[PDB]
Design an enzyme around this catalytic site. Structure first.
Site, PDB file in Angstrom:
ATOM      1  N   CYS A   1      53.218  23.443  71.654  1.00  0.00           N
ATOM      2  CA  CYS A   1      53.745  22.372  70.821  1.00  0.00           C
ATOM      3  C   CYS A   1      53.251  22.530  69.384  1.00  0.00           C
ATOM      4  O   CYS A   1      52.439  21.740  68.909  1.00  0.00           O
ATOM      5  CB  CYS A   1      53.432  20.980  71.377  1.00  0.00           C
ATOM      6  SG  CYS A   1      54.401  19.678  70.665  1.00  0.00           S
TER       7      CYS A   1
ATOM      8  N   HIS B   1      53.439  19.020  75.626  1.00  0.00           N
ATOM      9  CA  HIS B   1      52.044  19.123  76.027  1.00  0.00           C
ATOM     10  C   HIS B   1      51.952  19.187  77.550  1.00  0.00           C
ATOM     11  O   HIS B   1      52.058  18.165  78.225  1.00  0.00           O
ATOM     12  CB  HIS B   1      51.221  17.970  75.447  1.00  0.00           C
ATOM     13  CG  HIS B   1      50.889  18.171  74.009  1.00  0.00           C
ATOM     14  ND1 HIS B   1      49.616  18.489  73.591  1.00  0.00           N
ATOM     15  CD2 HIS B   1      51.649  18.147  72.905  1.00  0.00           C
ATOM     16  CE1 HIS B   1      49.616  18.631  72.276  1.00  0.00           C
ATOM     17  NE2 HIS B   1      50.839  18.426  71.838  1.00  0.00           N
TER      18      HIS B   1
ATOM     19  N   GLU C   1      49.346  19.585  79.259  1.00  0.00           N
ATOM     20  CA  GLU C   1      48.070  19.019  79.666  1.00  0.00           C
ATOM     21  C   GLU C   1      48.049  17.502  79.469  1.00  0.00           C
ATOM     22  O   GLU C   1      47.075  16.858  79.851  1.00  0.00           O
ATOM     23  CB  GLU C   1      46.920  19.703  78.917  1.00  0.00           C
ATOM     24  CG  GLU C   1      46.616  19.134  77.538  1.00  0.00           C
ATOM     25  CD  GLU C   1      47.681  19.313  76.469  1.00  0.00           C
ATOM     26  OE1 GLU C   1      48.658  20.051  76.710  1.00  0.00           O
ATOM     27  OE2 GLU C   1      47.531  18.705  75.393  1.00  0.00           O
TER      28      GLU C   1
END
Ligand SMILES: C=C(O[C@@H]1C=C(C(=O)O)C=C[C@H]1O)C(=O)O
Ligand SMILES: N[C@@H](Cc1c[nH]c2ccccc12)C(=O)O
Ligand SMILES: N[C@@H](Cc1c[nH]c2ccccc12)C(=O)O
Ligand SMILES: [Mg+2]
Ligand SMILES: [Mg+2]
Ligand SMILES: [Mg+2]
Lengths: 665, 632
Positions: free
Chosen positions: B68, B128, B130
């Protein structure tokens, strides 16, 4: 750092499957060693946890392990035995084991359990594969069962004293569930045991404890046991909810071993006023000084206490301490950057069980009248319980007026347009003159807004009147960490049904969820810097809590500290609170510096206690009045994101002031 | 060893989250480095992969993932399932904060969520992984590690490969008879059963080429003997797997792009069970056959049963014309003349009662019934004494025959068509396999698959009883437990050679039906560690857990005592090692070994807690039926 895990190998029967799961669960592969290895030659030191893989292997090698069983059983390290046989159990545990009612090898069993130790956070039942058709019924009195099968045999146990654990299944079998979680749990147990390892220096204090089976009114304890003037603290669970808030804490600086302590960011000097009256000025960074003193003054937790605060420091961390974390020293606070009372004597109220606990320190080998105080204060509390059982305002002045605040939100919206921030917590600071004194004004405030993290600090330089509901960091003595960031606010409604509407709105609005989500990610990042791999998780997301002034959207984040990471170090890494800055913290704090044109002080900081056990419990300073020189300061703010309307976000700052403004009136 | 990953901190609120996800996905924490740190000092060599959070980065030769680089927005992400999106559902949910390349994914907004550099090992995700609001974050990070493993495996050949496609597909048996000499050393890897996804190709060849060799091995002396084209035979005292590893590395040749398979010539042959002595077993018994036997095939015929064409493969020395081109031309002419109209009835001799008749008129087993029954009872006793969980007890049958290999094999393949059939005609023996079992299929890229079979049911004498026995196999608790314990065992083998987090089981307890029997089959996949060769993988997994029982090492000591003799080619592995580093190996079951006027065939079964003795004996006779029939 990380745990060094030792994986004992028996003919490589299942050793590499256990290898995989430990690695994925913990982010660290174990060291593999055969059951024939020389344990004396092997440095059992460094290895913080032992996993014993099952056989069957060689009759000879199994016999050799038994001869040298005491190398592992009496080593003091956490051990996990994985589905051992009749002999493997006799060696490591020393119990009797028979044939099971359903004696299939590779049997798929349903396992019910107490949710303790290695079974933490697992559903009950859960599926697990059993290899050995051997299982126990009668256990020696030294062994405690933790789990049972659907065919009524012991699937898990522990030794009551030594950190040994047994599972009578294969976590890492393809037919088992929650295998990785069981290995992570065992890793977490290893961290706790390592942290409990004292050694170090002899404790300089001797904690004495007395319980008193009475519970008077907490304000009456304030008036009855503490002085009318002088430096006091009152940590106030003005709201009491099972699982949420249970205890209150009160004390003063009158004790002989008490100290008052303060810090300035400009100077970088700690000032410690002892009981003599003499103030000492040593120079070292605050979080650094605090760590050393917490390490020096370490006292074991008293397991008879249902709480973790076993005396220690009580006070606040100011926002400007950011200068010593990841922030800049842009603005100097009018108040101390930190201020703590080192409490040698404290009254604890147990609102659940309806009793009091009295804590007092003597120096080791000395009688400083701790026991005399306990006996005396107990008598006072007994008598006390009989008398009493349990916009911004007309003269207020905002730092930024409406027009100035809207322009500052615009700046924030440009910042987020340019990608310099994903969310900015723009805050204002309101000052009003008052003729009110600390205790009466706090009496008003706590009535208006019962909260889990209420507080009245009466210090020489200022008085802090907090009605915060927000948990910054609760850190266990075992090194478990919890943070409950709040972001997303709704005013209460007029009617019941209006309330339920704003409840539903807050929980379901995309805008608010995004605000909260980004902070969760930010807090997770902070915790991951100091926590073990695999330990950080989010047990609850986007929960609405209701309090007298507002509805709040709250998420819970947990983790476990790395070995060698102190509680102070954890607080440093997470300070200031992400919920009060924005994402990314550092760049968003630069923007804060420029735009706010002034300091925050105690507002946006943390307020709570650091204990000598290693535990801590800290709130975020919101819904708080700072009282000094007949001035009443309170800070307010709200999340600025790309979707943010200016006027709604200004109105939000007004709504968050209700409590403070109503109390000042 | 393990992979070494580098995470570039670009000073945002994500580095430490990524740190967690990489740690869990790969079982190894990344080395975190700040962006402002000088790349002049950095040991880029010491690292194997780079992750970038929101210059020398891209031009380092290393695999890179850009993470990103409107706000806090949740989006459904649809994708093609390639590279970092491997095995993810489409759509899936992802949180997102913020030419010439190839887009891989798109949001419900219509924004590119994934991209790829077409040449460079460079991937981008415009979300993202995560983030707490994202799904399959750890899977994406695991995929990237796998992509980086492969990239490094893909990093001079003593040979040049020549390829020729012929747009005919004659009958495979006509190819064997028409193209190969008949007398002399030949191989025929025979997909006698062709089923999309299960089997597609056949491979044939002989030793007449100028660069062909013939390898044998004896564990007794620990000597490898290699026969060259000139007639000379080199002899060396060492282990076979090290020898194999060396030769395959030395004789590396990359995969030809216009071939739809990864066998680009190499070694074709078998690994005998007694090679366990140089894996995790003991040299308890000496085989009467070579413990390994392989033809280095420099010339081969590939049949593509799916597409109806042949591929002709020929090796020249890098600088020489060794008549490879001439062979392609000649062989292509022969093949087109064999292409005529395609010629079957399944043999019903596999119904329960009759299938368990015996081992034939002229046959005798090593252990007669009473002898075998006692070794089952023994197995059970050790199982009670917790010395094994599952034992694959086997017998060996010898029977005189005057039958020659090819006519016998022609009968066998008709009786029992399978994905992994083989006729090896070697100097010392012929091997007539009707195996259905996949031991190890290893890609050039280092992807590994094993499909252990465990759980057997005979065919029904009636079609209704057949469908009864089939559903019984898929559901019975006993057979599932047998299979599961092998799955864990094979998982254990592969975890010693595969990267942490790469080993998984995409399918469990699948019933496959063949002419003689119904079989319960599970699939295990993994991905090799860097430094681990294809040969090293095989050594770690050999012998196949499906043929030993659990736990392997102890159980293989037990089988030594009870069986009182070698298995030889039976219970070993048969297939090819390619020069590309790929391999495809079967378990040697349902096989006749032909030598010196007699046929040898092994048969066995798993012994567990609840194994009935009479039934486990009947099982071994049932399994002999195809072989017994062919010999009649
Ligand atoms: C031993 C043989 O088969 C093995 C035994 C099986 C079983 O017990 O179900 C099935 C698969 C094979 O690994 C054989 O066919 O000879
Ligand atoms: N709620 C805490 C005690 C507490 C009240 N107010 C606080 C302010 C700061 C820290 C702790 C507290 C408990 O129940 O244990
Ligand atoms: N069935 C394999 C080729 C093959 C046939 N028989 C074999 C025996 C051993 C190894 C491979 C094979 C394929 O479709 O490609
Ligand atoms: Mg599972
Ligand atoms: Mg998710
Ligand atoms: Mg069987």
């Amino acid at each position: 750092r990380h745990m060094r895990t030792l994986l004992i190998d028996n003919y490589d029967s299942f050793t590499h499957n256990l290898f995989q799961y430990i690695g994925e669960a913990t982010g660290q592969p174990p060291v593999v060693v055969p059951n024939d290895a020389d344990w004396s030659r092997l440095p059992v030191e460094d290895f913080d946890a032992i996993v014993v893989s099952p056989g069957p292997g060689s009759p000879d090698r199994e016999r050799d392990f038994g001869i040298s069983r005491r190398a592992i059983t009496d080593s003091g390290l956490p051990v996990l035995g994985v589905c051992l046989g009749h002999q493997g159990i006799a060696q490591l545990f020393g119990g009797t084991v028979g044939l099971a009612p359903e004696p299939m090898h590779g049997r798929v069993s349903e396992v019910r359990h107490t949710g303790e130790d290695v079974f933490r956070g697992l559903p009950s039942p859960f599926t697990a594969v059993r290899y050995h058709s051997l299982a126990a019924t009668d256990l020696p009195d030294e062994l405690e069962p933790l789990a049972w099968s659907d065919d009524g045999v012991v699937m898990g146990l522990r030794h009551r004293e030594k950190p040994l654990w047994g599972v009578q299944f294969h976590p890492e079998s393809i037919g088992s569930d929650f295998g990785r979680e069981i290995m992570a749990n065992f890793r977490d147990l290893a961290l706790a045991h390592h942290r409990a390892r004292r050694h170090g220096a002899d404790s300089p204090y001797e904690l004495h404890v007395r319980r008193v089976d009475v519970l008077p009114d907490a304000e009456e304890v304030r008036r009855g046991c503490l002085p009318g003037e002088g430096t006091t603290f009152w940590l106030d669970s003005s709201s009491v909810l099972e699982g949420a808030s249970r205890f209150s804490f009160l004390g003063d600086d009158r004790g002989p071993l008490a100290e008052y302590l303060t810090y300035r960011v400009a100077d970088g000097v700690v000032s410690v006023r002892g009981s003599d009256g003499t103030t000492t000025r040593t120079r070292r960074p605050f979080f650094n000084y605090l760590e050393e003193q917490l390490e020096r003054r370490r006292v074991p937790v008293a397991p008879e206490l249902p709480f973790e605060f076993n005396l220690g420091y009580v006070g606040y961390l100011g926002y400007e301490l950011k200068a010593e974390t990841t922030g800049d020293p842009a603005h100097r606070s009018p108040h101390p950057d930190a201020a703590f009372l080192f409490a040698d004597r404290a009254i604890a109220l147990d609102h659940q069980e309806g009793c009091c606990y009295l804590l007092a320190l003597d120096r080791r080998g000395h009688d400083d009248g701790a026991r005399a105080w306990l006996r005396e204060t107990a008598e006072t509390l007994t008598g006390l319980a009989v008398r009493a059982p349990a916009g911004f305002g007309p003269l207020a002045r905002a730092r930024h007026d409406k027009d100035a605040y809207l322009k500052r939100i615009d700046e924030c919206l440009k910042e987020i347009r340019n990608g310099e921030s994903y969310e900015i917590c723009l805050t204002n600071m309101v000052t009003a003159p008052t003729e009110a004194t600390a205790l009466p004004l706090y009496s008003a405030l706590r009535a208006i807004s019962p909260v889990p993290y209420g507080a009245l600090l009466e210090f020489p330089e200022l008085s802090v009147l907090s009605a915060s509901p927000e948990r910054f960091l609760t850190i266990g003595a075992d090194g478990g960490v919890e943070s409950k960031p709040i972001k997303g606010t709704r005013p209460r409604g007029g009617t019941a049904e209006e309330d339920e509407r704003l409840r539903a709105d807050l929980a379901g609005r995309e805008k608010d969820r995004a605000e909260n989500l980004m902070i969760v990610d930010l807090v997770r990042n902070d915790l991951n810097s100091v926590c073990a791999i695999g330990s950080v998780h989010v047990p609850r997301l986007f929960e609405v809590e209701t309090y007298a002034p507002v509805h709040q959207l709250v998420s819970t984040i947990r983790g476990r500290l790395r070995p060698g990471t102190s509680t102070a170090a954890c607080v440093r890494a997470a300070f200031p609170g992400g919920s009060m800055t924005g994402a990314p913290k550092k760049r968003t704090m630069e923007i804060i510096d420029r735009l706010e044109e002034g300091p925050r002080g105690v507002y946006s900081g943390a307020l709570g206690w650091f204990a000598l056990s290693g535990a801590a419990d800290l709130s975020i300073v919101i819904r708080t009045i700072v009282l000094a020189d007949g001035q009443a300061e309170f800070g307010v703010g709200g999340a600025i994101v790309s979707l943010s309307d200016q006027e709604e976000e200004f109105t939000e700052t007004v709504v968050k002031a209700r409590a403070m403004v109503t109390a000042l009136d």
